[PDB]
Design a protein around this ligand. Structure first.
Ligand SMILES: [Zn+2]
Length: 459
């Protein structure tokens, strides 16, 4: 009989916890039994399993593997690899299920499970179903097997063979002591670049900055190093390698919507009418740019899981979102991969005589506010958004209510949405001029006040 696990580790799309607290070796075993049971129930006995470079990785992955084996699954054990290399395995090996044991970009003691079953990721009720299986002892029992698989060379060669770099580039590569250190610097060198490594040693203690390029502060060392070495570009991978931060030769941070402008231009050039998915936090310039080149832009809900689901439903060739996940289907498999993104970026930049700063600066840029967060309460957060959706007046503008309220005007846009995990409203504004930016802020400030005249509006 399985033990009692804390419900708190079963999240919307994955499982996550703190080793020694909410996650133990024992937990990993039973999670494997649940995932294996569900995979068999979906007709898939073959499951790939990988882990990142965390201190708890070896111990916990061994239990995860045993739990899968104890259901009767045939496990393909790929060992320590980046998350996207595990995804690669689950696309090229016999089975379509895979489990990645990773705490991603989080502090050292965190770990967790990213799960794909019979070709799809689980969400919401499906992750809760795993929890339920354990609770009720609704688990398969069988005599499975494990095969050690060395997938990294295959992955390396698959990318190297398809990337066609032109001019040599000097690149600072910061892995934040996460698992991308096993391949990113090596692959980037193999493509033709000269690499300046920062924190490329795999060390689960994360003694330098945590591997999270989503926080600019975790790019300070990279920016300084690019400037000091007169490098052409800087890249910072997150801890498991499914995201990469980008810095130009002058230190400018390139956010995902601007990266997507560059990637979209390239993808659409060889694929007339290609669908390109992005989120409601992305610059409006992206919609126009994709359309101008003959693509079909789709502005969608925030969240990499939702973006991916929309990509699959539309047959899109490329997708990305502001938290940093980028998905290529063109020339690739459709899953998010920071290393592949880096390779695709290097390919494009290498074919342009301009420096990376100017390649990116040439795209239209507008005036933008830093993202705004308004602390409210858990009781009011969704209701404020709902009240706006029912009754707000936005004037002449294109209204999008897929995720909060976004309004696109001829000269700019605004967004207000509720955070899904904190009692906070999140806003963004952009416009072609300061005057238009202030006008749009005023529209939103006024609509918020029309919901609750006493709400604290910090803008
Ligand atoms: Zn990640």
């Amino acid at each position: 009989k399985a033990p009692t696990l804390p419900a708190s580790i079963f999240r919307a799309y994955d499982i996550r916890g703190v080793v020694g607290d909410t996650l133990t070796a024992e937990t990993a075993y039973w999670i494997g039994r649940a995932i294996g049971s569900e995979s068999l129930a979906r007709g898939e006995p073959c499951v790939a399993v990988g882990r990142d470079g965390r201190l708890s990785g070896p111990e916990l992955v061994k239990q995860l593997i045993q739990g899968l084996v104890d259901c009767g699954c045939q496990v393909s054990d790929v060992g320590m690899v980046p998350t996207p290399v595990l995804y690669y395995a689950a696309n090229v090996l016999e089975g379509k299920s895979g489990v990645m044991l990773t705490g991603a970009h989080n502090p050292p003691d965190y770990n967790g499970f990213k799960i794909v079953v019979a070709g799809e990721t689980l969400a919401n009720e499906q992750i809760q179903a795993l929890r339920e299986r354990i609770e009720k002892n609704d688990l398969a029992s069988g005599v499975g097997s494990v095969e050690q698989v060395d997938i990294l060379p295959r992955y390396f060669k698959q990318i190297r063979d398809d990337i066609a770099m032109a001019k040599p580039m000097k690149v600072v590569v910061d892995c934040g002591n996460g698992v991308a250190g096993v391949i990113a610097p090596q692959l980037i060198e193999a493509l033709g670049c000269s690499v300046i490594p920062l924190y490329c040693e795999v060390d689960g203690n994360f003694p330098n900055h945590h591997p999270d390029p989503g926080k600019p502060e975790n790019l300070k060392d990279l920016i300084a190093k690019v400037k000091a070495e007169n490098a052409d570009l800087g890249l910072a991978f997150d801890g498991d390698g499914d995201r990469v931060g980008v810095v130009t030769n002058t230190g400018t941070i390139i956010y995902p919507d601007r990266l997507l402008m560059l990637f979209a231009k390239d993808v659409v050039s060889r694929n007339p009418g290609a669908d390109i998915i992005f989120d409601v936090k992305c610059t409006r310039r992206l919609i126009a740019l994709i359309s101008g080149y003959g693509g079909r832009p789709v502005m969608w809900k925030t969240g990499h899981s939702l973006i991916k689901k929309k990509m699959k439903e539309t047959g899109a060739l490329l997708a990305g979102e502001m938290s940093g996940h980028v998905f290529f289907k063109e020339r690739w498999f459709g899953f998010d991969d920071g290393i592949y993104s880096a390779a695709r970026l290097l390919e494009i930049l290498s074919q342009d005589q301009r420096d990376s700063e100017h390649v990116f600066s040439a795209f239209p840029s507008d005036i933008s506010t830093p993202e705004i967060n308004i602390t409210v309460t858990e009781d009011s957060k969704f209701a404020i958004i709902e009240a706006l959706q029912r009754d707000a007046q936005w004037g002449e503008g294109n209204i999008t209510t897929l995720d909060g309220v976004r309004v696109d005007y001829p000269k700019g846009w605004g967004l207000v949405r509720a955070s899904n995990t904190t009692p906070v409203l999140v806003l963004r504004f952009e416009a072609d001029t300061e005057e238009e930016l202030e006008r749009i802020k005023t529209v939103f400030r006024n609509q918020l006040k029309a919901v609750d005249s006493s709400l604290p509006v910090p803008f």
